[PDB]
């Protein structure tokens, strides 16, 4: 029985209609056009010269509205401001296809969709999980900066990521729309070290519930570890603190298996499945959220 | 690794999705110009679903028997049946119709799916048409009429319309010429599904991806020719390998010949013996040569 658990993205049409190309002097990258505002990474101001230590405050003061051109794929720039690692440009036409939206900062273990773009043209979409060291996997080439990540609630888009960087191990990071870089990385072309990754406990738990729902509950036992005992165990064993949610509780009702029983299962499975499989895997999986499992397996 | 399950942006296709209702049944349709395509079992009452007479159902229908709703409503002015699909004609041409073709895909080909419910796009993912003509993905009740598609240039190729779930939880559907992949039938009955196989050309692509990422411990000078590997594939659950320009480009860039990777595959099939390739301990066959070119090179 194939599970039905797949990496699934939100439809990107609403976001595709907001993607533009932003150019400053020699550099070009993507931006997000919402109403009369265009968002993009501030390193579009940096010339290839000074990328290893740009003075962004200095670059900004050196700019005029005429320093920027936004091309859609006719937008005069009439304002420019900097917000953390982002530019907040103002243009004289409101995007007619602006969706309803909010901004959020995702937390580790949450998933979102990314629309990868090059020169203002959407080219691909995929789903990522914000890792406990605040990097993401995904696929991003040169020219992808300014690609955006988002979730959907209703037909409301929650914008949460704007792409900035590749890290040393090949993972990626970017800004939230308040200007802050996920993981405190600097938007400078300087070697930087990401922290060690961990297993997202709550996603692992959702995945075992997915397993149970699929008729694989061989790992379930009456044994229970409390959330508190687990969370102390987790410090020493490369797991995140478990945090319960309504979404997880609904999987426990549906299956009749308590979160504490799966916390115990994780302590045992973490040393290996000992020859057994779960959902065709020999390792614990943590890139499926409880929402994914409710939505994809129970249509909730 | 840099190699991920990546779908085509779905906006061009969202604009074409509608809901089609016929009596009790409701599902999704595809609205292109003055035509709305949908699975013909929208005509079947729940009761008669195990062996419908689609020919008799269609003659009993009038144009008012189909209701079509966008998320406006669209007046049906013609109805016809093409294999397992209905071809409805509506009096409004979809003003956001993309340039499109209807090409049937072959095993090993990957395409994007836009999963919809009651005419509303709700998710997108990428699947591989397996050698037994099934796909995986995620399809719940209400998902029939969801479409699979690729985009080459400005042109969308529509290649799949969702019809059913098999007993093992895989899925299958129609091409837009009205044929069902794998000649499954659009009847609610247990059906014999052929045995799966590894898609050899996709395994080669993935090995090239490994090479491109600095993981080449498995490459030897030894070679196995295409014809020899294909005789072996018959006995070991692999598809015939057929090269393409896209694979040739991976060979050019890495300097590793196809034939070296076919030898490697014959040896890696018995076990990696404690090694990993791109984080994996089994052969991966769900990424195409085109995927590897695009995601690791930009072609
Ligand atoms: C913008 O399009 C581009 C996207 C990356 C290119 C390859 N993959 C990408 O995601 N962003 C950059 O090139 C940044 C620009 C700086 C001003 C932030 N730099 C960068 O991505 O590479 C330098 C890395 C090297 C690895 C590291 F971990 F050490 C950190 C710096
Ligand atoms: C249309 O929305 C629906 C989609 C499936 C519902 C569950 N997952 C799906 O992808 N398709 C159907 O309901 C078909 C209708 C027929 C007229 C084709 N039937 C179906 O998919 O389920 C019945 C299967 C169950 C397993 C089996 F081996 F017995 C074969 C029949």
XYZ file of C-alpha atoms and ligand atoms in Angstrom:
661
model
C 0.000 0.000 0.000
C 1.542 3.265 -1.157
C 0.972 5.815 1.577
C -0.388 8.828 -0.230
C 2.089 11.058 1.588
C 3.858 13.242 -0.980
C 5.734 16.516 -1.075
C 2.901 18.793 -2.178
C 3.088 22.545 -2.891
C 0.431 25.225 -2.864
C -0.691 26.319 -6.363
C 1.578 29.192 -7.349
C -0.670 31.221 -9.715
C -1.399 33.940 -7.143
C 2.317 34.447 -6.522
C 3.420 34.106 -10.157
C 1.418 37.224 -10.904
C 3.484 39.214 -8.447
C 6.937 38.318 -9.693
C 8.990 41.052 -11.344
C 12.582 41.669 -12.263
C 14.479 44.346 -10.336
C 17.579 45.928 -11.822
C 20.109 48.262 -10.235
C 23.119 49.218 -12.318
C 24.670 45.895 -13.276
C 22.883 43.393 -11.000
C 19.411 41.988 -11.637
C 17.315 39.684 -9.519
C 13.685 38.916 -8.771
C 11.249 40.912 -6.707
C 7.756 40.656 -5.332
C 5.272 43.298 -6.521
C 2.357 43.783 -4.080
C 0.113 46.813 -4.555
C 2.497 49.791 -4.971
C 5.483 48.087 -3.322
C 8.281 45.972 -4.767
C 10.301 43.819 -2.380
C 13.745 42.510 -3.265
C 17.093 41.614 -1.647
C 19.256 44.642 -0.932
C 22.334 43.044 -2.478
C 20.962 44.084 -5.857
C 22.690 47.393 -5.003
C 26.067 45.827 -4.553
C 28.344 45.688 -7.599
C 30.408 42.549 -8.126
C 33.310 44.642 -6.830
C 32.416 44.918 -3.174
C 30.272 41.808 -2.505
C 32.599 40.435 0.196
C 31.962 43.447 2.451
C 29.425 45.856 1.009
C 28.497 48.920 3.000
C 24.755 48.698 2.505
C 23.926 51.895 4.348
C 26.386 53.693 2.067
C 25.061 52.110 -1.116
C 21.499 53.064 -0.219
C 22.308 56.725 0.385
C 24.139 56.714 -2.962
C 20.959 55.657 -4.796
C 18.142 57.566 -6.411
C 14.742 56.374 -7.494
C 16.195 56.439 -11.018
C 18.853 53.910 -9.904
C 16.205 51.176 -9.942
C 14.106 49.809 -12.772
C 11.421 47.230 -12.224
C 10.345 45.191 -15.242
C 7.201 43.052 -15.280
C 6.899 39.735 -17.174
C 5.553 50.148 -16.935
C 6.766 50.765 -13.333
C 8.617 53.949 -12.398
C 10.274 53.708 -8.988
C 9.110 56.617 -6.840
C 10.459 55.498 -3.462
C 13.158 53.387 -1.947
C 13.741 52.238 1.619
C 15.798 49.500 3.257
C 14.369 47.045 5.782
C 16.969 44.699 7.198
C 18.270 42.647 4.295
C 15.488 43.740 1.912
C 14.715 46.740 -0.249
C 11.185 48.077 -0.074
C 10.700 49.981 -3.343
C 7.660 52.010 -4.213
C 6.327 52.122 -7.751
C 3.651 54.240 -9.371
C 1.332 51.425 -10.520
C -0.440 49.105 -8.117
C -0.219 45.445 -9.067
C -3.725 44.707 -10.389
C -3.351 41.019 -9.529
C -2.234 41.476 -5.936
C -3.656 38.617 -3.835
C -4.829 38.954 -0.292
C -1.797 38.369 1.907
C -0.048 38.560 5.247
C 3.577 38.209 6.295
C 4.797 35.548 8.708
C 8.034 34.279 10.122
C 8.048 30.501 9.913
C 9.559 28.440 12.715
C 11.648 25.258 12.380
C 9.657 22.250 11.270
C 7.088 24.279 9.322
C 6.755 23.709 5.586
C 6.194 26.226 2.855
C 6.135 26.436 -0.930
C 8.822 28.190 -2.909
C 8.340 29.605 -6.404
C 11.831 29.655 -7.958
C 12.318 32.456 -10.480
C 15.037 33.667 -12.790
C 14.920 37.156 -14.294
C 11.360 37.643 -13.109
C 10.170 34.417 -14.813
C 8.723 31.652 -12.601
C 10.376 28.400 -13.509
C 9.656 25.899 -10.756
C 7.865 25.251 -7.522
C 8.621 22.870 -4.639
C 8.082 22.514 -0.903
C 10.677 22.874 1.826
C 10.795 22.465 5.602
C 12.510 25.160 7.640
C 15.208 23.145 9.371
C 16.095 23.546 13.081
C 19.327 25.271 11.982
C 17.230 27.742 9.888
C 18.332 26.575 6.448
C 16.263 25.037 3.703
C 17.022 22.527 1.026
C 15.278 23.249 -2.273
C 16.867 23.964 -5.675
C 18.248 27.454 -6.313
C 20.724 28.461 -9.019
C 22.425 31.743 -9.860
C 19.769 34.367 -10.537
C 17.298 32.864 -8.052
C 17.622 35.539 -5.343
C 14.321 37.226 -4.647
C 12.353 34.019 -5.240
C 9.691 33.826 -2.563
C 8.291 31.256 -0.194
C 4.723 31.260 1.121
C 1.867 29.296 2.559
C -1.869 29.598 1.867
C -4.813 29.834 4.303
C -8.046 30.291 2.502
C -7.127 32.101 -0.698
C -4.883 34.235 1.587
C -1.168 33.982 0.904
C 1.210 34.144 3.869
C 4.509 35.363 2.542
C 7.352 34.079 4.626
C 10.614 33.772 2.673
C 12.649 35.712 0.150
C 15.704 33.906 -1.135
C 19.223 35.282 -0.480
C 21.969 32.690 -0.209
C 23.479 29.254 -0.551
C 25.363 27.960 2.485
C 28.559 25.969 2.695
C 26.839 22.558 2.776
C 24.562 23.387 -0.198
C 21.444 24.325 1.792
C 19.923 27.792 1.505
C 18.561 30.721 3.432
C 16.775 33.994 2.910
C 14.840 36.713 4.714
C 11.475 37.036 6.316
C 9.647 40.060 5.065
C 10.471 42.022 8.217
C 14.018 42.097 6.819
C 15.640 39.580 9.123
C 17.694 36.685 7.782
C 16.634 33.232 8.863
C 19.387 31.932 11.070
C 21.104 35.296 11.507
C 23.282 34.799 8.401
C 24.792 37.901 6.810
C 23.979 38.880 3.232
C 27.686 39.086 2.416
C 29.771 36.808 0.220
C 31.701 35.484 3.199
C 32.142 31.910 4.334
C 29.615 31.211 7.079
C 29.006 28.043 9.077
C 25.537 26.646 9.603
C 24.750 24.892 12.883
C 24.028 21.203 13.176
C 20.642 20.047 12.019
C 18.212 18.087 14.177
C 15.219 15.854 13.783
C 11.943 17.791 13.930
C 10.197 15.795 16.644
C 6.622 16.874 15.908
C 6.958 16.005 12.201
C 8.425 12.589 13.021
C 5.397 12.012 15.228
C 3.023 13.047 12.445
C 4.767 10.610 10.098
C 4.382 7.690 12.501
C 0.671 8.600 12.733
C 0.605 8.523 8.933
C 2.158 5.078 9.285
C -0.522 3.920 11.727
C -3.254 5.347 9.474
C -1.783 3.233 6.659
C -1.945 0.070 8.782
C 1.686 0.016 9.901
C 1.603 0.143 13.742
C 4.124 -2.571 14.558
C 6.149 0.007 16.527
C 3.311 0.979 18.835
C 3.457 -0.262 22.393
C 1.575 0.743 25.572
C 4.809 2.297 26.851
C 4.641 6.071 27.151
C 7.253 8.805 27.525
C 5.982 12.156 28.761
C 6.513 15.239 26.662
C 8.806 16.582 29.404
C 10.943 13.432 29.706
C 11.144 13.218 25.911
C 12.213 16.847 25.608
C 15.049 16.236 28.044
C 16.035 13.065 26.186
C 15.956 15.095 22.958
C 18.617 17.612 24.035
C 21.216 14.899 24.153
C 20.048 13.010 21.011
C 19.725 15.521 18.161
C 15.945 16.018 18.390
C 13.994 19.249 18.743
C 11.723 19.915 21.661
C 8.344 18.331 21.002
C 5.482 20.851 20.993
C 1.905 19.575 20.694
C -0.734 21.095 18.436
C -4.408 20.767 17.683
C -3.300 19.262 14.377
C -1.354 16.491 16.166
C -4.182 15.902 18.653
C -6.550 15.218 15.784
C -4.275 12.447 14.542
C -4.242 10.949 18.028
C -8.039 10.964 18.206
C -8.312 9.483 14.687
C -5.910 6.616 15.481
C -6.475 6.109 19.189
C -2.693 6.251 19.735
C -1.392 8.776 22.244
C 1.423 11.206 21.508
C 3.304 9.795 24.502
C 3.344 6.297 22.997
C 4.937 7.668 19.831
C 7.466 9.661 21.839
C 8.529 6.353 23.361
C 8.558 4.737 19.915
C 10.911 7.451 18.711
C 13.365 6.752 21.534
C 13.480 3.116 20.394
C 13.424 3.653 16.617
C 16.133 6.322 16.846
C 18.708 3.537 17.283
C 17.429 1.842 14.084
C 14.349 -0.095 13.009
C 16.239 -3.396 13.460
C 15.298 -4.844 10.069
C 11.792 -3.426 9.843
C 10.443 -0.682 7.583
C 7.990 2.157 8.093
C 6.370 3.635 4.964
C 9.160 2.100 2.935
C 11.883 3.794 4.990
C 14.548 2.516 7.366
C 15.058 5.997 8.920
C 12.685 8.363 10.734
C 11.253 11.027 8.399
C 10.680 14.621 9.543
C 9.686 16.558 6.414
C 5.952 15.830 6.780
C 4.005 18.071 9.146
C 0.849 17.115 11.050
C -1.076 19.370 8.672
C 0.334 17.439 5.677
C -0.838 14.191 7.210
C -4.312 15.439 8.119
C -4.730 17.048 4.718
C -3.184 14.344 2.541
C -4.371 11.248 4.353
C -7.718 12.273 5.902
C -8.727 15.225 3.715
C -8.982 17.498 6.751
C 22.234 17.283 -3.435
C 20.351 20.169 -5.076
C 18.008 17.681 -6.800
C 14.411 17.981 -5.577
C 10.882 17.161 -6.693
C 10.058 20.289 -8.637
C 6.775 21.064 -10.379
C 6.003 23.505 -13.171
C 4.342 26.743 -11.990
C 0.655 25.984 -12.041
C -0.915 29.383 -12.764
C -1.468 28.687 -16.472
C -3.439 25.583 -15.550
C -5.322 26.959 -12.532
C -6.952 29.438 -14.907
C -8.433 26.505 -16.838
C -9.953 24.473 -13.990
C -13.695 24.237 -13.584
C -16.238 22.147 -11.759
C -18.538 19.844 -13.735
C -21.751 18.466 -12.257
C -24.083 15.822 -13.663
C -26.877 14.703 -11.369
C -25.267 13.483 -8.161
C -21.671 13.314 -9.408
C -19.300 16.286 -9.262
C -15.645 16.494 -10.290
C -13.164 18.763 -12.077
C -12.971 19.717 -15.705
C -10.439 21.371 -17.944
C -11.620 24.437 -19.811
C -9.659 25.181 -23.016
C -11.095 27.709 -25.454
C -14.748 26.585 -26.032
C -14.199 23.041 -24.709
C -14.483 21.546 -21.218
C -12.874 18.106 -20.787
C -13.750 15.814 -17.901
C -13.967 12.104 -17.009
C -17.051 10.514 -18.505
C -18.033 8.767 -15.282
C -19.457 12.100 -14.074
C -22.446 10.619 -15.940
C -22.652 7.489 -13.810
C -24.947 7.201 -10.780
C -23.176 5.853 -7.717
C -25.285 2.693 -8.045
C -24.339 1.759 -11.634
C -20.585 2.482 -11.136
C -19.284 -1.112 -11.307
C -20.348 -1.650 -14.942
C -21.787 1.477 -16.551
C -23.161 1.706 -20.042
C -21.436 4.894 -21.001
C -22.897 4.699 -24.502
C -26.448 4.668 -23.128
C -25.777 7.313 -20.477
C -24.470 9.704 -23.129
C -27.535 9.381 -25.371
C -29.859 10.031 -22.433
C -28.031 13.330 -21.737
C -28.979 16.747 -23.019
C -26.896 19.855 -22.928
C -28.719 20.965 -19.771
C -27.565 17.735 -18.057
C -24.103 19.201 -17.470
C -23.523 22.169 -15.228
C -20.137 23.899 -15.386
C -18.890 26.361 -12.821
C -15.693 28.432 -12.651
C -13.923 29.331 -9.381
C -18.987 32.386 -13.374
C -21.037 29.517 -14.751
C -20.753 28.358 -18.347
C -23.586 27.299 -20.653
C -23.128 23.867 -22.266
C -24.043 23.959 -25.977
C -22.639 20.617 -27.076
C -21.675 17.290 -25.593
C -19.632 14.427 -27.004
C -17.659 11.432 -25.733
C -14.058 10.652 -26.700
C -12.909 7.360 -25.176
C -13.026 7.824 -21.391
C -13.443 11.586 -21.562
C -16.327 13.877 -22.236
C -15.786 16.816 -24.552
C -18.322 19.494 -23.654
C -18.732 22.627 -25.724
C -19.525 25.812 -23.883
C -20.608 29.207 -25.213
C -17.678 31.143 -23.675
C -14.056 30.726 -24.805
C -11.675 30.530 -21.837
C -9.976 33.958 -22.034
C -6.921 32.571 -20.216
C -6.366 29.515 -22.381
C -2.627 28.775 -22.690
C -0.897 27.480 -25.767
C -1.236 23.751 -25.503
C -0.862 20.306 -27.033
C -2.203 16.890 -26.079
C 0.720 14.449 -26.095
C 0.553 11.033 -24.431
C 3.610 10.394 -22.248
C 5.601 7.191 -21.916
C 6.949 5.408 -18.835
C 9.793 7.219 -17.133
C 8.424 10.622 -18.119
C 7.752 13.004 -15.278
C 4.907 15.520 -15.279
C 3.262 18.008 -12.960
C -0.175 17.396 -11.474
C -2.552 20.093 -10.231
C -4.781 18.360 -7.683
C -8.239 19.978 -7.564
C -11.497 19.508 -5.639
C -14.823 21.032 -6.697
C -13.019 22.989 -9.338
C -10.588 24.569 -6.815
C -6.815 23.988 -7.202
C -5.552 22.819 -3.830
C -2.087 21.341 -4.413
C 0.572 20.560 -6.965
C 3.163 17.794 -7.120
C 5.269 15.911 -9.626
C 4.911 12.261 -10.593
C 6.599 9.688 -12.796
C 4.529 7.545 -15.115
C 5.752 4.135 -14.002
C 6.402 1.242 -16.386
C 3.165 -0.334 -15.165
C 1.321 2.851 -16.204
C 0.470 3.980 -12.695
C 1.465 7.098 -10.803
C 1.697 7.791 -7.125
C 0.882 11.281 -5.932
C -1.967 12.212 -3.600
C -5.561 12.020 -4.838
C -8.568 11.880 -2.521
C -12.273 11.544 -3.205
C -13.314 14.422 -5.436
C -10.006 14.631 -7.302
C -11.079 13.098 -10.608
C -10.511 15.448 -13.517
C -7.310 16.832 -11.984
C -4.770 17.250 -14.750
C -1.105 16.483 -15.338
C 0.966 18.631 -17.684
C 4.444 19.678 -18.691
C 5.583 22.980 -20.210
C 8.130 23.199 -23.020
C 8.676 26.799 -24.033
C 5.387 28.676 -24.023
C 3.435 25.440 -24.758
C 1.698 23.397 -22.048
C 1.482 19.702 -22.928
C -1.572 18.238 -21.202
C -0.950 14.530 -20.711
C -3.076 13.204 -17.841
C -6.614 13.485 -16.474
C -7.208 11.742 -13.198
C -9.673 8.824 -13.137
C -9.064 6.303 -10.351
C -7.076 4.718 -7.577
C -5.825 1.129 -7.832
C -5.917 -1.420 -5.050
C -2.377 -0.730 -3.883
C -3.047 2.987 -3.551
C -1.451 4.063 -6.823
C -3.416 6.006 -9.442
C -4.173 6.178 -13.126
C -5.931 8.325 -15.645
C -6.563 9.209 -19.278
C -4.537 10.905 -21.974
C -6.473 13.627 -23.695
C -6.996 11.477 -26.739
C -9.419 9.632 -24.427
C -7.300 6.503 -23.900
C -6.605 5.233 -20.391
C -2.958 4.703 -19.512
C -2.199 1.008 -19.276
C -5.610 0.206 -20.810
C -7.149 0.172 -17.380
C -10.923 0.595 -17.525
C -13.003 3.373 -16.010
C -15.088 0.972 -13.954
C -15.008 0.550 -10.202
C -13.593 -2.981 -10.076
C -10.357 -4.598 -8.921
C -8.006 -4.640 -11.899
C -4.770 -6.511 -12.645
C -1.825 -4.072 -12.452
C 1.434 -5.166 -14.117
C 4.673 -5.379 -12.169
C 6.748 -2.231 -11.788
C 10.325 -1.863 -13.072
C 13.203 0.520 -12.557
C 13.281 3.281 -15.205
C 16.817 2.762 -16.450
C 17.277 6.101 -18.155
C 16.241 7.912 -14.987
C 18.704 5.915 -12.889
C 21.501 6.967 -15.262
C 20.422 10.604 -14.881
C 20.556 10.289 -11.126
C 24.015 8.726 -11.297
C 25.121 11.659 -13.434
C 23.681 13.930 -10.799
C 25.817 12.111 -8.222
C 28.895 12.562 -10.411
C 28.074 16.244 -10.894
C 27.954 16.614 -7.114
C 31.402 15.087 -6.469
C 30.131 11.563 -5.649
C 31.710 9.211 -8.187
C 33.039 6.327 -6.082
C 30.879 3.943 -8.144
C 32.329 4.831 -11.558
C 34.792 2.337 -12.957
C 36.415 2.071 -16.397
C 34.305 -1.017 -17.014
C 31.417 -0.694 -19.428
C 28.303 -2.507 -20.470
C 26.917 -1.673 -23.903
C 23.361 -0.522 -24.453
C 22.270 -3.713 -26.228
C 23.926 -5.948 -23.644
C 22.422 -3.945 -20.737
C 18.990 -4.158 -22.346
C 19.168 -7.964 -22.530
C 20.126 -7.935 -18.840
C 17.332 -5.458 -18.042
C 14.753 -7.983 -19.252
C 15.827 -10.423 -16.586
C 16.303 -7.913 -13.771
C 13.206 -5.672 -13.702
C 14.669 -2.674 -15.539
C 13.267 -0.922 -18.587
C 15.128 -0.892 -21.877
C 17.579 2.031 -21.835
C 17.057 4.524 -24.680
C 19.441 7.475 -24.838
C 18.408 11.066 -25.508
C 20.128 14.382 -26.230
C 19.479 15.281 -22.625
C 21.450 12.254 -21.363
C 24.151 12.895 -23.957
C 24.638 16.318 -22.410
C 25.219 14.833 -18.986
C 27.760 12.494 -20.522
C 29.533 15.372 -22.235
C 29.704 17.538 -19.118
C 31.002 14.796 -16.781
C 33.192 12.863 -19.205
C 31.525 9.659 -17.937
C 29.996 7.505 -20.622
C 26.486 6.101 -20.473
C 28.015 2.636 -20.794
C 30.067 3.112 -17.654
C 26.920 3.914 -15.697
C 25.051 0.926 -17.141
C 27.822 -1.288 -15.797
C 27.574 0.599 -12.510
C 23.820 -0.033 -12.392
C 24.253 -3.796 -12.852
C 26.584 -3.805 -9.856
C 24.653 -1.362 -7.673
C 21.425 -3.338 -8.180
C 22.699 -6.133 -5.878
C 23.490 -3.655 -3.064
C 25.496 -0.553 -2.186
C 27.238 -2.589 0.538
C 27.290 0.178 3.113
C 27.828 3.151 0.817
C 25.384 5.904 -0.099
C 24.748 7.862 -3.286
C 23.289 11.344 -2.893
C 22.059 10.401 0.544
C 20.494 7.195 -0.760
C 21.136 3.546 -0.224
C 18.830 2.404 -3.093
C 18.779 3.354 -6.773
C 16.534 6.379 -7.520
C 14.548 6.457 -10.712
C 12.139 9.356 -10.232
C 14.376 12.107 -11.668
C 14.751 12.478 -15.409
C 17.698 13.559 -17.497
C 15.816 16.824 -18.095
C 15.470 17.324 -14.313
C 19.165 16.827 -13.784
C 20.075 19.195 -16.600
C 17.787 21.907 -15.251
C 18.350 21.640 -11.528
C 22.147 21.099 -11.534
C 23.213 23.094 -14.751
C 20.360 25.463 -15.820
C 19.497 23.841 -19.164
C 21.267 35.322 -5.630
O 20.616 34.899 -6.791
C 22.276 34.160 -5.219
C 21.594 32.737 -5.136
C 22.662 31.644 -4.882
C 23.625 31.371 -6.058
C 23.899 29.849 -6.058
N 22.775 29.308 -5.183
C 22.104 30.285 -4.549
O 21.158 30.194 -3.748
N 22.866 34.589 -3.970
C 24.215 34.711 -3.735
O 24.988 34.378 -4.618
C 24.847 35.225 -2.355
C 25.081 36.713 -2.463
C 25.583 37.411 -1.163
C 25.521 38.925 -1.273
C 24.814 36.943 0.050
N 26.083 34.524 -2.010
C 26.083 33.145 -2.064
O 25.012 32.590 -2.193
O 27.216 32.332 -2.044
C 28.284 32.514 -1.092
C 28.245 31.546 0.096
C 29.275 30.432 0.038
C 28.917 29.358 1.019
C 28.837 29.935 2.468
F 28.296 29.048 3.313
F 30.061 29.994 2.937
C 28.156 31.348 2.622
C 28.441 32.263 1.446
C -12.790 10.333 -8.884
O -12.712 11.487 -8.092
C -12.201 9.133 -8.014
C -10.718 9.365 -7.473
C -10.311 8.280 -6.474
C -11.091 8.259 -5.124
C -10.055 7.710 -4.095
N -8.747 8.085 -4.691
C -8.843 8.397 -5.979
O -7.925 8.735 -6.744
N -12.228 7.957 -8.794
C -13.041 6.943 -8.534
O -13.798 7.043 -7.558
C -13.067 5.617 -9.401
C -14.347 5.612 -10.224
C -14.437 4.622 -11.374
C -15.601 4.906 -12.232
C -13.231 4.611 -12.251
N -12.912 4.401 -8.559
C -11.801 4.287 -7.689
O -10.789 4.947 -7.869
O -11.793 3.507 -6.575
C -12.156 2.181 -6.623
C -10.996 1.173 -6.658
C -10.538 0.624 -5.249
C -9.446 -0.474 -5.354
C -9.771 -1.551 -6.488
F -8.732 -2.394 -6.714
F -10.768 -2.373 -6.080
C -10.190 -0.897 -7.816
C -11.369 -0.010 -7.590
